[PDB]
Design a protein around this ligand. Structure first.
Ligand SMILES: [Mg+2]
Ligand SMILES: [Zn+2]
Ligand SMILES: [Zn+2]
Lengths: 79, 49, 99, 1336, 98, 278
DNA sequence: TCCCAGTAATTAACGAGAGCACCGGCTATGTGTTCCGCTATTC
DNA sequence: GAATAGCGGAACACATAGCCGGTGCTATACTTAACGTTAATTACTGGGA
């Protein structure tokens, strides 16, 4: 369900931070530690990642915040 | 070769650069069905085993 | 049977194939005329008249072929071979003028 | 893992540390068993076992018994891949020299010893003894002795003197050499010397010795003592089928070396006489020196097939070495290829993949899915499922293909549009269906051209191919901002046929309530596709900030142009389809849609354009018949007239009135006239041949002839292939390039005879051989251009400079070639470009000039925009994103990271297959003679006393449309600063008479103008005037050489007329071959003629401009501004004394006296103005007029090769090659820094070293910038691997290895070779992370 | 012709020639320049590391593919180790340093 | 100044010794054989031209010329080592044997890349001489059968010795004439498995371990130590009899039971003998 | 005494498709043992 | 189930013989070996200012 990545590039600049951010997000979803935010339309994890970029609910800041929060939650599992 | 009823007109893009439409009645008539004969070989050597 | 692109002609300038196509249509028209004269059994005489008229044209050619020396079996056997199209020799720089 | 690759000399104990045993026997394997033989070139105790975890005895055979050296065999059980990484070493019985440090032409043993190479090889071949520290009792240290000379010297000196012979002598030299003291001695001698040849020699010797001290090496490691062998699986002995074997050729040379080393060992052990052991060392040393390279030292030793064996250095050099065959480009799995076809139903990000290639490539994904569905629990079942191609493996394939881009690519990959990505669509076929709009990018025809496919496996690559390499992303070319997906040949003819009108078709004059009733009328057959019809359209402007505003109207247009309008998206104005809409008019619609609307409704627009252009050329039925070539009726008349004229001129030539050379250009004249008149008399017959009538008489119009609509519309035709179908096809050439007199006067409709067809066949076999050799040159050109521009990467965001070149429109004598707007579209400014109301800044200083700032310059008519350029960017190791400019294939500024060097190399590389008296103002403007002195002549007009005289036609708006250059000494019919008309011959001069005109008036004298010595008597024998003409210095006597005829002017009152303004006298020493018509004592005026003096390739021009070769006649320039004179004239050399007004006078220059000089020996020349004439090298341009002059010279002189062939290329791509040519800058004075005087350090490093020194309290370095060609500036690189992966490798590895050089892995070929990410695009942020985390 | 994974050549572990030894298409140096001309680094790295040459790398690539995870653990191409041992089999100590 | 190739320098060098007369040779050998090294030096230094003359005939075999000369030099040194002047013979007749035989052994040794021994090369030269004499009797190439006929030796022996005359080809020679394709492009690395067979083995190993842990413990320990599979060593039924279960017959019984359970477990996944063995 | 011009070498030129003694030392070779495995008999 | 016996037989190892495989020796005299570019550039070397 994706032809042009143009609006994703409008969100994340430089055309290359896009590819690194979408790669990190699709690694989150493929190695199944995660689940998609926007619903999948039987798209591959790559295109769900790009549509998540296009809504603007994933970028490098959101990913770093969520990974730091995940590590905090994992550190809260010591007990 | 084989001489065929031809026409010069652009037909819906399927004959765009140098591409060529061919009617199915050409392949029903088997006008271009070439025969190829290959040769396969099998030697039976004398190995040291 | 084959649809071909026209724009490949006037940039590559192989304008000879337009005349090859036209003379192919001429020769195939002659083949279908003999095939129509052969579908009904017309006569070997009228067939001799038409095939000789097809060998007469055009003007100032060699091999005047006189069909009166054919013995009504070779006219039949010649008609059965021409019926898919009268084959036409056009030498290299002696040519077939468009008239 | 590793940061840098270090190369150095390898000691004789490093080689014993790599190695795992001494290869003592020549024999490779056994012959009954095929067991490796102990202990020859394939062993197992040396190089490892042959089978995985298994000895040679086999008594230890498991991974359980890993690592233990055996007892019966000594073979350490490991993996069997250890035979690719274990070396053995040969112990040579005598030392032998290494051939790379001996024969690579700046020979390191030679210039390290300062011993000439002939004397060294006369020692190594045992011919001549050389002293080794015999002392100066009688001899020198590095003096050779011949044999009898040695014998008598040994008679006089049995003791106190030692002269060895051979490689032991050379090794005693090297290990006896001191480095510091010899370097001190050479430094003092370099300090004392003044001859620049010896200065350069001592600089080279000092630099070699200093690199030898700084690296950890010693000099004697150049002489091999322990020779290391390659591991066996890098030179295998694979058995062929049938008891047959095949060897790499290294096993033979290694066997030869081991044989001669064994025989030498036994020859020493038998105590042979010395002749045999000297012949034996000569024989080794050479078996070795062959092994290391074959063909260098004399002739190569050959194998059985009379071919030389492939040595070690042959596996690195050239196209068959590792460097450009196995390491730069590799063969690649998950790949395949096929023939291609059209399939024009595709959307432009799609491609057709067959079900047999796509089943093969996507194999492991289908295994990974068939394990996932439970349809096969293993891989041995999931393999046999896809083996028999079940019904369910075809549903899995449609899943694993769905959003996985593939990578189509044609075979001559030129630019980055030759590899694109497409979401594939499955075809029941065997061919690759491929969208028609992208074959323009690939340069792909469907005549059997094959394309290869590729699979992005990893998750980053499936995003890389979607964000960067997808077809819908690449719509603009990287070379210039032109679109690249333009409709090519069939769609445009269909769109031409739709958007037309005839004078009377069906339904003409009816009114239409929308662009949909236009479809309903035409599909019901009620109106033609060309009928002038009032429709109502509804077009949307976005005049406000994105506000689409409706405005219905009533447009007089066609039923075709109204049907087509529904394809056009919302924002476009209706007047883009209200024309005939040929090929050019489409690409300026599919570009305005890209600019106005954006990317997505242009990618959706190009598909609808193609779908409509195919569908309406289907219904067009547009054929070509033989009656479509209307031969003109006046062709016979024109040819009859031009055949009468040639017979008349042929009679006249026989009447002797004209020669052969005069009737030649008179017959070629009449034939080139009639060839035009035919082609012009048929074009009024082609295009106007429709003469149809609407309600009345007749109306002519543009024709519906089929061969006119395929050339007028630009869809695959021109006006030069026509005129060869109906008109005569003109004159033809011959193999000398000379033009045949009697032209070929038959079109291709009338056919050619035998002779006209034979004549017009050299023109084809000359054109075909041209494209044969042209590709072979143009491959090598872009090969050089890529490697000169590797490491250029957009690394900063603003370098912060205010320098940068100044741009001007290209006014090349007549019209504007390229205007200012198209040169400075998309490049940020360096100064604030301000309107000619110069109190207000029109643009800011650092604005990026897109179109909306281009038009503000186009209204206020600015002529000169100072711009920020690449070659002035102040970035160390890269180019700032401001100084580069726009992205150029993206509308925005360049993204930080993106490697401009390769994309600017390819944009010059790929067009390379398309390569091989009076001045009249022709417009209305004002005359502007620029910056030139010019005196009033005796006729009152203006005659020219300036060399660089420039005529400008300044318009009413202060710009130039016509510029000119005037020679010295031309009478001006007009004056400066005043408006003149067109056709005005403003200046005039004789191209032969060179005037030596004065500036003062009064009674001239012939001072120092005498006969018999200086002048001769050759008066006007035709009229009767005493002409006092001058001979030359080559023919006159030696008493009047420097005594030149001057023109001193006095009056009748005893006073002398001197130069006004100054106190200098007014005399003009005329040189030889001077023809003076005046007299002495007669009055002269200002501007009077004193003495009347008499006087490329397409591709190799680019290949010599980028190489910057010296042209054979350089324009000698003015090396220092000041007055000029002539020194002591030698036999062929006129020592041109250039005296500055204040500076150092004695710069004299030997000019070849036979060359035509230009300066009149007394003129105060500005620095860098011509002394003679000719094409100039860019080396002189650079050294005199600076960097910004050579960066204009090269980009002018190569755009005048590309625009001549009609190829547009933006100039940044040439500015970066200029920037990469001058990376090296030798020093003039070192200053307080740590450099030498005459050394050539790279300018980037000296831009930091003295930068911190001026940041310190010290002084900087004075350096002159230096220009190198692209075969030398790419070969003088810091990273020794990006220079060795190129032309000569044995030079670069040797020069680096004696220097202890160390690649830093900062470019792109090096990171490609080593296998990590390049530091360019997606791999830029990771290298930033690496360089941040390192040194932290 | 198309090859997923076939037979690699002898001295350098790279695929073979076209359609007779079932071989991969050559990704020559001009195509390398074309990939460098984009921002595409990962595609080029996997293309000359793990689709082609890294011997321990591509089995890990294959087992990553068939186990549904498109990662790569690239390493160092084998042809460069061949170049290392070949330059070093002259008298030229060339070493990777860190 | 000589032109510096190795052959011209040597052949110009060797003439700097006058050839010795018979009494001269005998006297020099008398001095040489009692340990005077100068006499050995004179005798070997003079007759180098004999070595070039003898090794002139052995040219255009596998060895280059100077290799033949230097190997003849070794035999000449052997000849002065064992010359007898007491037979009264001229030295050339005795040294000719040693030089000719030590160049013949050199061509038999250092020619073939796969070193055949002496007797195999003499046996092959017997057959090649027989074929050269047999080709003039039937005017075609004599077969292996024809040479085996003319020597009355077994046909398999002559076939083997002629197949040991293979003339081992190069790899780096191009194929098809056009210099684009040598044997490196044709040859496939046959010992190294590609990724397909290498992942089939690892998947099969993990599947085996999974099925074994799907089987009960007493069966799978027998089937683990029985084949050395689950981190064990491949043990005998007698060995695991004394080690785990004292009745060897019961160890066979539990082995057959585990094999039947694993047969069922494999065929539940559809892997039959036709599946794993085609 | 330094510049300078002819001479020779080195680098590059697309892409993908004889003849015998003699000995010794390895190795095939009987052969024993042996050890394992398999089967068959009997409490 | 479990001990015991027979028994094939696979094979492994050990001791030997035998036969591949490396080496030495031969005695009229004998004496110096084997047919193009194209351009550019640079190092070298004899020649001139
Ligand atoms: Mg083509
Ligand atoms: Zn062993
Ligand atoms: Zn900058």
């Amino acid at each position: 369900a994706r032809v042009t990545v143009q609006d994703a590039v409008e969100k994340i600049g430089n055309r290359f931070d896009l590819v690194l951010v979408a790669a990190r997000r699709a690694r989150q979803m493929q190695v199944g530690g995660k689940d998609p935010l926007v619903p999948e339309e039987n798209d591959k994890t790559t295109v769900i990642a790009l549509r998540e970029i296009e809504e603007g609910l994933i970028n490098n800041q959101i990913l770093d915040v969520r990974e730091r929060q995940e590590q905090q939650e994992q550190e809260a599992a010591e007990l | 070769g084989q001489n065929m009823r031809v026409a010069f007109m652009p037909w819906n893009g399927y004959n765009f650069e140098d591409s060529i439409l061919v009617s199915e009645r050409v392949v029903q008539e088997d006008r271009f069905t070439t025969i190829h004969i290959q040769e396969l070989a099998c030697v039976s050597r004398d190995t040291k085993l | 049977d084959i649809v071909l692109n026209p724009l490949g002609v006037p940039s590559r300038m192989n304008i000879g194939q337009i005349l090859e196509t036209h003379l192919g249509m001429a020769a195939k028209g002659i083949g279908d005329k003999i095939n129509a004269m052969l579908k009904q059994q017309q006569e070997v005489a009228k067939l001799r008249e038409f095939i000789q008229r097809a060998y007469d044209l055009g003007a100032d050619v060699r091999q005047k072929v006189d069909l009166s020396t054919f013995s009504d079996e070779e006219v039949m056997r010649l008609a059965e071979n021409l019926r898919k199209g009268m084959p036409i020799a056009t030498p290299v720089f002696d040519g077939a003028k468009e008239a | 893992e590793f940061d840098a690759i270090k190369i150095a000399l390898a000691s004789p104990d490093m080689i014993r540390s790599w190695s795992f045993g001494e290869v003592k026997k020549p024999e490779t394997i056994n012959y009954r068993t095929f067991k490796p033989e102990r202990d020859g070139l394939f062993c197992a105790r040396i190089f490892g076992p042959v089978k995985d975890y298994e000895c040679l005895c086999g008594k230890y055979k498991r991974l359980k018994h890993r690592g233990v050296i055996c007892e019966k065999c000594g073979v350490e059980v490991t993996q069997t891949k250890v035979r690719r990484e274990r070396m053995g070493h040969i112990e040579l019985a005598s030392p032998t020299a290494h051939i790379w440090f001996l024969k690579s032409l700046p020979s390191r043993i030679g210039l390290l010893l300062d011993m000439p190479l002939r004397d060294i090889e006369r020692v190594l071949y045992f011919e001549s003894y050389v002293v080794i520290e015999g002392g100066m009792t009688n001899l020198e240290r590095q003096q050779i002795l011949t044999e009898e000379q040695y014998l008598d010297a040994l008679e006089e000196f049995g003791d106190e003197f030692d002269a060895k012979m051979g490689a032991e002598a050379i090794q005693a030299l090297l290990k006896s050499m001191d480095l510091e003291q010899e370097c001190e001695q050479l430094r003092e001698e370099l300090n004392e010397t003044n001859s620049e040849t010896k200065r350069k020699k001592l600089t080279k010797r000092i630099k070699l010795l200093e690199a030898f001290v700084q690296s950890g090496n010693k000099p004697e490691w150049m002489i091999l003592t322990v020779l290391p062998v390659l591991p066996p699986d890098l030179r295998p002995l694979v058995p062929l089928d049938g008891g047959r074997f095949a060897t790499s050729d290294l096993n033979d040379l290694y066997r030869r070396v081991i044989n001669r080393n064994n025989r030498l060992k036994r020859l020493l052990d038998l105590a042979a006489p010395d002749i045999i052991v000297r012949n034996e060392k000569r024989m080794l040393q050479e078996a070795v020196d062959a092994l290391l390279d074959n063909g260098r030292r004399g002739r190569a030793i050959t194998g059985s097939n009379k071919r030389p064996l492939k040595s070690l250095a042959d596996m690195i050099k050239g196209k068959q070495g590792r460097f450009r065959q196995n390491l730069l480009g590799k063969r690649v799995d998950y790949s395949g290829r096929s023939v291609i076809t059209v399939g024009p139903y595709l959307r432009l990000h799609q491609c057709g993949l067959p079900k047999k290639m796509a089943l093969e490539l996507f194999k492991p994904f289908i295994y990974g899915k068939l394990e996932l569905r439970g349809l096969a629990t293993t891989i041995k079942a999931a393999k046999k499922m896809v083996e028999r191609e079940e019904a369910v493996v075809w549903d899995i394939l449609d899943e694993v293909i769905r959003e996985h881009p593939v990578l189509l690519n044609r075979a001559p990959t030129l630019h980055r549009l030759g590899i694109q990505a497409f979401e594939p669509v499955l075809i029941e076929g065997k061919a690759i269906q491929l969208h028609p709009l992208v074959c323009a990018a690939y340069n792909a025809d469907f005549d059997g051209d094959q394309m290869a496919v590729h699979v992005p496996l990893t998750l980053e690559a499936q995003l890389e191919a979607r964000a960067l390499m997808m077809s819908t992303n690449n719509i603009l070319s990287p070379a210039n901002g032109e679109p690249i997906i333009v409709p090519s040949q069939d769609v445009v003819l269909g769109l031409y046929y739709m958007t037309r009108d005839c004078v009377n078709a069906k339904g003409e004059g009816m009114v239409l309530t929308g662009p949909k009733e236009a479809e309903r009328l035409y599909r019901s057959g009620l109106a033609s596709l060309h009928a002038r019809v009032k429709v109502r359209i509804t077009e949307y402007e976005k005049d406000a900030n994105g506000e689409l505003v409706a405005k219905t109207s009533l447009k007089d247009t066609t039923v075709g142009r109204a049907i087509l309008w529904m394809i056009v998206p919302k924002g476009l104005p209706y007047s883009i389809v209200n024309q005939a809409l040929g090929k050019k008019a489409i690409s300026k619609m599919l570009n305005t849609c890209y600019r106005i609307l954006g990317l997505k409704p242009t990618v959706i627009f190009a598909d609808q354009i193609m779908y409509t252009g195919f569908a309406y050329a289907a219904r067009s039925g547009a054929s070509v018949g033989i009656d479509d070539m209307v031969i003109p009726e006046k062709k016979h008349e024109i040819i009859s007239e031009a055949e009468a004229e040639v017979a008349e001129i042929q009679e006249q030539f026989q009447s002797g009135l004209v020669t052969a050379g005069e009737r030649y250009n008179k017959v070629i004249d009449i034939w080139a006239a009639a060839n035009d008149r035919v082609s012009k008399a048929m074009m009024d017959n082609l295009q106007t041949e429709t003469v149809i009538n609407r309600d009345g008489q007749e109306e002519k119009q543009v024709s519906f002839n089929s061969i006119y609509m395929m050339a007028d519309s630009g869809a695959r035709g021109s006006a030069a292939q026509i005129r060869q179908l109906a008109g005569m096809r003109g004159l033809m050439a011959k193999p000398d390039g000379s033009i045949i007199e009697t032209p070929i006067t038959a079109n291709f409709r009338e056919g050619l005879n035998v002779l006209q067809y034979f004549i017009s066949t050299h023109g084809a076999r000359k054109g075909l051989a041209d494209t044969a050799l042209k590709t072979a040159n143009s491959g090598y050109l872009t090969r050089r251009l890529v490697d000169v521009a590797q490491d250029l990467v957009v690394t900063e965001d603003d370098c912060g400079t205010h320098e940068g070149i100044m741009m001007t429109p290209v006014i090349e004598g007549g019209d504007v070639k390229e205007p200012l707007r198209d040169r400075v579209l998309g490049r940020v400014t360096a100064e604030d470009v301000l309107k000619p109301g110069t109190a207000d800044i029109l643009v800011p200083r650092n604005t990026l000039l897109h179109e909306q700032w281009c038009d503000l310059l186009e209204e206020n008519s600015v002529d000169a925009v100072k711009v920020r350029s690449v070659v002035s960017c102040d970035t160390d190791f890269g180019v700032c994103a401001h100084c580069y400019g726009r992205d150029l294939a993206r509308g925005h500024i360049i993204n930080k990271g993106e490697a401009i060097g390769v994309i600017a190399a390819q944009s010059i590389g790929e067009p390379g297959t398309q390569l091989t008296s009076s001045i009249q103002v022709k417009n209305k403007g004002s005359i502007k003679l620029s910056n030139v002195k010019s005196v009033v002549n005796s006729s009152g007009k203006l005659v020219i006393t300036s060399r660089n005289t420039e005529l400008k036609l300044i318009d009413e708006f202060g710009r130039t449309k016509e510029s000119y250059k005037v020679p010295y000494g031309a009478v001006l019919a007009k004056g400066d600063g005043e408006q003149v008309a067109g056709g005005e011959t403003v200046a005039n001069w004789d191209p032969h008479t060179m005037p030596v005109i004065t500036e003062v008036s009064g009674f001239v004298r012939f001072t120092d103008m005498i006969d018999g010595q200086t002048i001769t008597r050759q008066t006007d024998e035709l009229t009767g005037l005493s002409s006092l003409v001058v001979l030359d210095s080559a023919e006159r006597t030696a008493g009047g050489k420097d005594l030149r005829p001057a023109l001193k002017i006095v009056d009748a009152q005893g006073n002398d007329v001197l130069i006004p303004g100054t106190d200098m006298p007014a005399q003009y020493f005329l040189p030889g071959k001077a023809i003076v018509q005046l007299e002495d004592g007669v009055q002269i005026s200002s501007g009077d003629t004193l003495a009347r003096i008499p006087q490329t390739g397409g591709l190799p021009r680019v290949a010599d401009l980028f190489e910057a070769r010296r042209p054979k006649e350089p324009a000698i320039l003015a090396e220092i501004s000041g007055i000029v004179s002539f020194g002591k004239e030698t036999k062929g050399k006129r020592r041109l004394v250039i005296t500055p007004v204040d500076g150092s006078d004695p710069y004299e220059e030997m000019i070849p006296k036979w060359r035509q000089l230009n300066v009149f020996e007394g003129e105060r020349v500005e620095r860098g103005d011509v002394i003679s004439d000719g094409p100039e090298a860019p080396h002189d341009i650079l050294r005199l007029r600076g960097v910004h002059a050579v960066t204009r010279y090269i980009v002018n002189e190569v755009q005048d090769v590309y625009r001549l062939q009609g190829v547009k290329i933006n100039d940044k791509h040439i500015e970066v090659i200029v920037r990469q040519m001058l990376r090296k800058a030798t020093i003039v004075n070192a200053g307080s820094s740590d450099f030498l005087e005459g050394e050539q350090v790279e300018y980037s490093r000296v831009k930091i070293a003295n930068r911190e020194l001026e940041a310190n309290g010290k002084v900087g370095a004075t350096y002159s910038r230096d220009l190198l060609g692209i075969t030398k500036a790419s070969l003088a690189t810091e990273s020794f691997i990006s220079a060795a992966s190129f032309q000569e490798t044995t030079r670069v590895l040797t020069e680096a290895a004696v220097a202890g050089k160390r690649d830093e892995l900062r470019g792109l070929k090096e990171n490609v070779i080593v296998g990590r990410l390049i530091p360019a695009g997606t791999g830029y942020a990771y290298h930033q992370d690496r360089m941040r985390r390192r040194a932290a | 012709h198309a090859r997923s994974t076939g037979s690699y050549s002898l001295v350098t572990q790279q695929p073979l020639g076209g359609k007779a030894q079932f071989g991969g298409q050559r990704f020559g140096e001009m195509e390398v320049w074309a990939l460098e001309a984009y921002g595409a680094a990962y595609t080029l790295q996997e293309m000359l590391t793990v689709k082609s040459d890294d011997v321990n790398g591509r089995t890990k690539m294959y087992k990553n593919i068939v186990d549904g995870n498109h990662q790569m653990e690239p390493g160092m191409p084998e042809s460069f180790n061949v170049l290392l041992k070949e330059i070093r089999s002259l008298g030229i100590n060339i070493e990777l340093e860190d | 100044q000589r032109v510096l190739d190795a052959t011209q320098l040597y052949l110009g060098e060797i003439g700097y010794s006058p050839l010795l007369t018979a009494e001269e040779e005998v006297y020099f050998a008398r001095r040489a054989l009692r340990g005077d090294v100068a006499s050995r030096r004179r005798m070997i230094e003079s007759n180098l031209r004999l070595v070039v003359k003898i090794a002139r005939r052995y040219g255009n075999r596998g060895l280059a010329l100077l290799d033949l000369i230097e190997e003849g030099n070794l035999g000449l040194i052997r000849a002065v080592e064992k010359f007898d002047p007491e037979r009264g013979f001229r030295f050339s007749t005795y040294a000719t044997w040693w030089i000719r035989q030590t160049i013949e052994r050199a061509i038999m040794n250092q020619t073939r890349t796969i070193r055949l021994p002496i007797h195999i090369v003499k046996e092959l030269n017997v057959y090649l001489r027989t074929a050269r004499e047999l080709s003039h009797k039937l005017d075609h190439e004599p077969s292996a059968e024809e040479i085996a006929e003319q020597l009355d030796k077994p046909v398999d022996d002559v076939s083997r010795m002629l197949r040991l005359n293979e003339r081992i080809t190069s790899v780096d020679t191009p194929l098809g004439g056009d210099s684009e394709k040598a044997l490196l492009d044709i040859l496939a690395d046959e010992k190294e498995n590609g990724p397909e067979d290498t992942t089939q083995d690892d998947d099969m190993k993990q599947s085996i371990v999974k099925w074994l842990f799907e089987l009960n413990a007493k069966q799978r320990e027998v089937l683990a130590r029985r084949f050395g599979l689950l981190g064990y060593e491949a043990a005998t039924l007698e060995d695991v009899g004394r080690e785990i279960g004292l009745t060897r017959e019961r160890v066979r019984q539990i082995q057959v039971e585990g094999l039947r359970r694993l047969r069922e477990i494999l065929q539940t996944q559809g892997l039959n003998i036709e599946a794993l063995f085609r």
